[PDB]
Amino acid sequence: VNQNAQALNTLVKQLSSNFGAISSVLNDILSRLDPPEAEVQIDRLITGRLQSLQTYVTQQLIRAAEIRASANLAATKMSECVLGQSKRVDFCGKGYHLMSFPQSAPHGVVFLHVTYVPAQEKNFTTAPAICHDGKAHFPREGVFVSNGTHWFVTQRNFYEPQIITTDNTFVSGNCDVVIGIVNNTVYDPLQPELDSF
Amino acid sequence: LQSLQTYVTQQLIRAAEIRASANLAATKMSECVLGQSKRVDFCGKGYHLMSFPQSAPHGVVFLHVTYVPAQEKNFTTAPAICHDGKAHFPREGVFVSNGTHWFVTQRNFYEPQIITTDNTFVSGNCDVVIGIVNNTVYDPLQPELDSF
Amino acid sequence: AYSNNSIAIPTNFTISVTTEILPVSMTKTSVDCTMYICGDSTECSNLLLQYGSFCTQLNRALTGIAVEQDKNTQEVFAQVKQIYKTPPIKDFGGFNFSQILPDPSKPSKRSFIEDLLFNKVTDLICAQKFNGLTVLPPLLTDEMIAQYTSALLAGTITSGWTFGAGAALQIPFAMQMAYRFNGIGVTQNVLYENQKLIANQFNSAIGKIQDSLSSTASALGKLQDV
Amino acid sequence: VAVLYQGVNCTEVNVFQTRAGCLIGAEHVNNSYECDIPIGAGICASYQTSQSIIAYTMSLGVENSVAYSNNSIAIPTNFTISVTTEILPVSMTKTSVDCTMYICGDSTECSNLLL
């Protein structure tokens, strides 16, 4: 709003500048000097006021390029952040994006974004794989964690400790390849069900 | 004054061009460096992994670590496996064969895996699928129940 | 080839590192209107003041350029307000980052790659200030922009994708590539079994990028054009 | 008020010299804080403590060394839902200017010279 007010204000104030003539008002010049000597002063006044109008049109087209870059960016945030869900980081704002609430504002728009940021952290012990019968086990979703006693499986985004099972891991490779593999016991849920049967 | 006005107008046009390049660099700064972008040919050729910024005069230099596959081999495929009369569709990956036994593997790398109940899923039947092939789906509980 | 029953799956891969050169800001210059006409004379001031506010609008315009040029570097160079440091004991799982990491033994903090980037682009600032074009220095000096880069590198090596979206969470880089392969559709089996081969692929790729920047000086021509 | 000169050392002239130029009326403090009013070449100023304007080196933020180890991992046990604010422009004032009335109105001779 300040660039339009300052642009219109300069655009009006240039009429008060004389631009090399006797006076800025055309009635004092046309009411005194004769028309043939006066036409030279009129051509200097038109050319000066003309240069101010072409200067104004060039600044408006240049400012039109920034308002169009911001408008296309607003349409991009409007598309990704509001209607759907954008997985881009630091696009819809800091944190993992969820939803955006648009709000009307004079000569623009304000976006209220709902983000997910973690708060409390705790140091854990990790291993890339679990060695049980001699063949390796890798996590299907998440990473391996331990509190110093038993190895747990949990997601990277939040802590939900789970017992190592066959559905939480997948069998690939062996124990002599992966660097950092640890030995533990993989729980098989079929065993107590068959013992009870 | 007219020569100076030409200079300032040309500088304003370069200010809009340098703003389009700086905001594009800031966007690539957020998506390529901090996180991981799955967009194709944004962070550079190949599947993007990581981007490393470096200070440079009046700009920035990005080192993009990408995943480009190299060697491949032609294999025989099929959309589904018909076993007991109902179609077995791949959960993750595709069905491949070397001409002897049908294998299950992902599209991004070749890692042979036998057909089990957990790598596929049962949906529909066998007549409605175009290109389905016949094979024997291995049941993991059959030898365990026989040994028990 | 095109067949209904034919498929191709890659049995091997390679890690390529490229370079894209994007200019950020240019040198900020502001030229005074009265001295550009002439100095030490009232004839330039009386006839130039007779044209009104042209100096003021062109001066406020060049000042507006210099402020936005500091703001573009502020939205790009510094993403986070927290400084991250590189630990002295380095075990990355077989990767050698000493080329891309800054060298503390140098008087000014810069990496081995930024040492070549500063040398391949051609005081001149005071020389331009002698003819009446004033070059205002940037708010962020070369050591701090390089410190922003070293902070962002140290965060990617240690914290990974966490510090961009929140507090920095420590993760080992050997497990970090497992998530980066799982995001692109590559099983982490490729990482854990071929990690020794990937270490030689990455170290050779960094050596080839360093050789391309040292042998070919026209790769920085995007900034040389500016 | 702290008066700053641009691209010149101290000539005429709490008179200090920085890379941006001669800075008078401000005090130089070796410690570094969060910036408020920026200047250039890594020096800014703020009003702090009987109070005056102090000049100081750009602080890049809190320096924190994150521990890194092979078997060490940190997973978040709690989360926070934050709302941020993004302001972007959309539209600007629509303006249309007419050549005759803007340059010369109520003038027949000047209106014929414009046509």
Numbering used by the authors:
A (entry chain A): 952 to 1148
B (entry chain B): 1001 to 1148
C (entry chain B): 706 to 827, 848 to 951
D (entry chain A): 608 to 620, 641 to 676, 689 to 754
Which lines from the publication concern this structure?
Following the acquisition of these datasets and the initial steps of image processing in Scipion, we employed a continuous flexibility analysis using HetSIREN to further address the extreme conformational heterogeneity inherent in this sample and characterize subtle conformational changes between the two temperatures. At 4 °C, our analysis revealed the presence of 1 Up and 2 Up conformations, which aligns with previous observations using conventional discrete classification protocols. At 4°C (a) the Spike always shows at least one (orange) or two (red) RBDs in its open position. The maps provide a sensible exploration of the different states identified by HetSIREN, including 1 Up and 2 Up conformations. To quantify the opening range of the RBD, we used centroids of two fixed regions within the core of the Spike protein (S2 domain) as reference points, specifically residues Val991 and Pro1140 from all three chains. Furthermore, we directly compared the local resolution computed by DeepRes20 between the HetSIREN maps and the maps obtained using discrete image processing procedures, including initial model generation and subsequent refinement. This comparison revealed an increase in local resolution on the HetSIREN map, with particular emphasis on the RBD and NTD, which are typically the most mobile regions and exhibit lower resolvability.
This glycoprotein forms a trimeric Spike that interacts with the host cell receptor angiotensin-converting enzyme 2 (ACE2) through a mechanism involving the receptor binding domain (RBD) in an equilibrium between RBD opening and closing. In this study, we worked with the Spike protein’s beta variant (B.1.351), initially identified in South Africa in the summer of 2020.
